[PDB]
């Protein structure tokens, strides 16, 4: 069986970055040249692996994490980065092994008047650990008065919609991102090349 990368890359809808999706790939064969040859990917940056060598090894696990962010935020999906997305939404480890793949999705994910379906976390007390996911919607206390789950001054809903509009500049346009993590442990190695 072919690895179901089409289900990931060609999915009709993507996850919000704060609620980023993870798909485990296993028990299948992949041709990674189908991905890295593509003129569609404006980002294709690998760490610890060369994409032209991914076909050379059977892995024990491949994970595909996917979500939508702004074009100006794709740079945050890299080891060692900081900012709202790296700190509070999706965090790669300092010594990540895998590839970060992104493409402009303005034609799919922007809407007249703003797409409110894609959200990010604006407020969080502390930074995420690598590969941590926070989907909570507790009202965020920015002042000394407790919020008791009620929004108001100094008491904020922690998530925010991107509101993608098709006429935005490219830095404000939505980008679909897929992060491929590659692992080889002392376990069955079932994710193979051609």
């Amino acid at each position, epitope marked *: 069986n072919l690895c179901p990368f089409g289900e990931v890359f060609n999915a009709t809808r993507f996850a919000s970055v704060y609620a980023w999706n993870r798909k485990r790939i296993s028990n299948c064969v992949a041709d990674y040249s189908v991905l890295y040859n593509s003129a569609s990917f404006s980002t294709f940056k690998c760490y610890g692996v060369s994409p032209t060598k991914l076909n050379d090894l059977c892995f024990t696990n491949v994970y595909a994490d996917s979500f939508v962010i702004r074009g100006d935020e794709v740079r945050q999906i890299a080891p060692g980065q900081t900012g709202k997305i790296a700190d509070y939404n999706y965090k790669l480890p300092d010594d990540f092994t895998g590839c970060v793949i992104a493409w402009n999705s303005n034609n799919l994910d922007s809407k007249v008047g703003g797409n409110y379906n894609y959200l990010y976390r604006l407020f969080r007390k502390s930074n995420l650990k690598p590969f941590e996911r926070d989907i909570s919607t507790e009202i965020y206390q*920015a*002042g000394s008065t407790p919020c008791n789950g009620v929004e108001g001054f100094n008491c*904020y809903f922690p998530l925010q919609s991107y*509101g993608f509009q098709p006429t935005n500049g490219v830095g404000y346009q939505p980008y679909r991102v897929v992060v491929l993590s590659f692992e080889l442990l002392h376990a069955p190695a079932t994710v193979c090349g051609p």
Partner: single-chain antibody
Amino acid sequence: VQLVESGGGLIQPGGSLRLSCAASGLIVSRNYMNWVRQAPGKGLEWVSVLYSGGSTFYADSVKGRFTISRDNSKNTLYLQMNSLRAEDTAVYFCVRDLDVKGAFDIWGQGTMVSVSSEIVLTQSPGTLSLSPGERATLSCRASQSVSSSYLAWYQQKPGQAPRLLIYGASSRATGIPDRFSGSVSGTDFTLTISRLEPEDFAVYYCQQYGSSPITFGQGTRLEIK
């Protein structure tokens, strides 16, 4: 809620200063806290930010010279300023940022420091002279596209900190009268005052916070004809 700055002075070039900003009502460690500066007779310049989670960012012109920090137990923000230059002369403001949820809404009173790429926002006219009761239109044009969610207008009276008028291009801040309105048409971002009151004569600044660094227009002086 209040922010109280201190630590400024008149210092020789090459010296150091440490600014302090004591907060009440808001918690420094829970907020995007910023330093913004204003040189004598000039506009506003973003200097530094400290995230609740600890990340820090700086304007290129102060990198390697200034350091932002906080003391949670003292609910205080600091700006350590080393290797001071004549160009660092400004009033320095401590400011809380709500970003798309409310922009720079809380400002301190400022502390004076005297020593002796980015989206450009162009405001027009430089000076706007009109009579009370008239409609005023003020323009702000960006050097590249800025989504409407990331635009704000401020009013500054003499000797005071700027006051947020409008954020997200068209959302009035709390307590701002409805004669103030904001709109975007093309690359032009406009502030309209439908009927000028005597208290409306002030300096007006636009701001974008969608691309780093945060930048401000050079200001429009609204004066009586």
